[PDB]
Structure 1
Amino acid sequence: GAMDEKFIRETIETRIMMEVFCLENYFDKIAGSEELLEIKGEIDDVEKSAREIFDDSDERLHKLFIRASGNELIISLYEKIWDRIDLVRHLNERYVVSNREHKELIERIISGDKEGAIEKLKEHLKNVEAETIKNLYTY
């Protein structure tokens, strides 16, 4: 259906529900993941310019959270809504700040700060929400 403000908000709320749940409950599995460190590299190497690299590190990081659950139902539900997540993601001009947020999120994860990592994930997702709605209004 139409990609209006409500559509965006629902997408982000769904992501918050699924990703926070997985990060909270599989925090240790995520923190000890070899993939997590691979992604850390992508997030650094990336120079402000290179979007393709941001979008790929972004997809990998958030899908990792979900995948860490080992729960095939949850994994496939997230896959079902990925194209919708990606469409919303296209309105995020501020995707260099997102990258910064991922850098800090991963750092809080690796340093054992679970509550801070959950806080940062929620903030990141709400920031994406705010940025995308802002941008949609201009068109």
Structure 2
Amino acid sequence: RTKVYNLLKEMILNHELKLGEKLNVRELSEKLGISFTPVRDALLQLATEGLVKVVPRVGFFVTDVDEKFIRETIETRIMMEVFCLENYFDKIAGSEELLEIKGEIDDVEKSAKREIFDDSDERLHKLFIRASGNELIISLYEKIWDRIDLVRHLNERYVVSNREHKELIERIISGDKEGAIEKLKEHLKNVEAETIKNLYT
């Protein structure tokens, strides 16, 4: 149930199962060599998360992504990341993980290696959330991050995002709370706009 959930989610997030694609439990079970029941269980789990849609009298489909999808994700990120950066600022600023990430970011500034960036991006934003120690918020944000991953194909600006991340960390390290928050908001709004523009290719 979990192995298969994780496998099917990976296939949706990396678009092996395409946005909007019709999903058939039996096809998947045969494709994956896994019985029917845990495939169905996993699809239902994915439906409650919004990555799968269940259309009465028809069946399961991979979610479509439209402007609303992107916008709702970004507003949710603003709400959660800002709350956590504001209220757990000193914990974040003093963390060993912030310094590791800072190094990754410097590496990207030189290499423009997208893979390192992707790592650093997930790590930085999840750090802000993890610092709360609130398992409920952490678990909710894991699913919000899935929505971000789903639209990664539209998020081309990584070189400029990396500069934004570099500056954000500098503000955090210096103690500039309000400046850090403003930079985080600017970054998220810039991502929103770029992501949406690329939706319309």
Global fold match (TM > 0.5): yes
Q: Secondary structure at the match of 2:124?
A: helix
How far apart, CA to CA, are the structure 2 residues paired with 1:126 and 1:4? 17
Deviation at 1:80?
A: 2.0
How far has the Cα of 1:78 moved from its partner?
A: 0.5
Partner of 1:42: 104
Residues 55-100 of structure 1: CA distance to partner in whole angstroms, max 9, x if unpaired? 0000000000000000000000001222111122331111100000
Is the strand fraction higher in 1 or 2? 2
1:8 Cα deviation after fit: 0.4
Larger Rg: 2
**Given that residues 129 and 138 in structure 2 are in contact (C-alpha distance below 8 angstroms), is that contact kept between their aligned partners in structure 1?**
yes
Deviation of the 1:48 alpha carbon: 5.4
Name the count of aligned residue pairs. 136
Query: Does the CA contact (< 8 Å) of 2:109 and 2:162 recur in 1?
Result: no
TM-score (norm 2): 0.66
Q: Does the CA-based 8 Å contact 2:105-2:162 persist in structure 1?
A: yes
Q: Distance in 2 between matches of 1:21 and 1:69?
A: 9
> Which residue is 1:68 aligned to?
131
Q: TM-score if structure 1 supplies the norm length?
A: 0.94
Distance 1:90 1:112 in 2: 34
Equivalent pair of 1:31/1:109 in contact (CA under 8 Å): yes
Residue aligned with 2:175, SS? coil
Once the two structures are TM-superposed, the CA of residue 47 in structure 1 deviates from its matched residue by: 4.5
Q: Is the 8 A contact 1:48 1:96 kept in 2?
A: no
Change (3 A) 1:9 1:48: farther
Between the aligned residues of both structures, percent identity stands at 99
Q: Distance in 1 between matches of 2:87 and 2:158?
A: 27
Quick check: 105-114 or 50-59, which moved more?
50-59
Contact 1:94/1:131 (<8 A) preserved:
yes
Instruction: Indicate the larger mover: 80-89 or 24-33.
Output: 80-89
1-side partners of 2:153 and 2:83: how far apart? 25
Structure number with the bigger relative contact order (C-alpha 8 A, sep ≥ 6) is 1
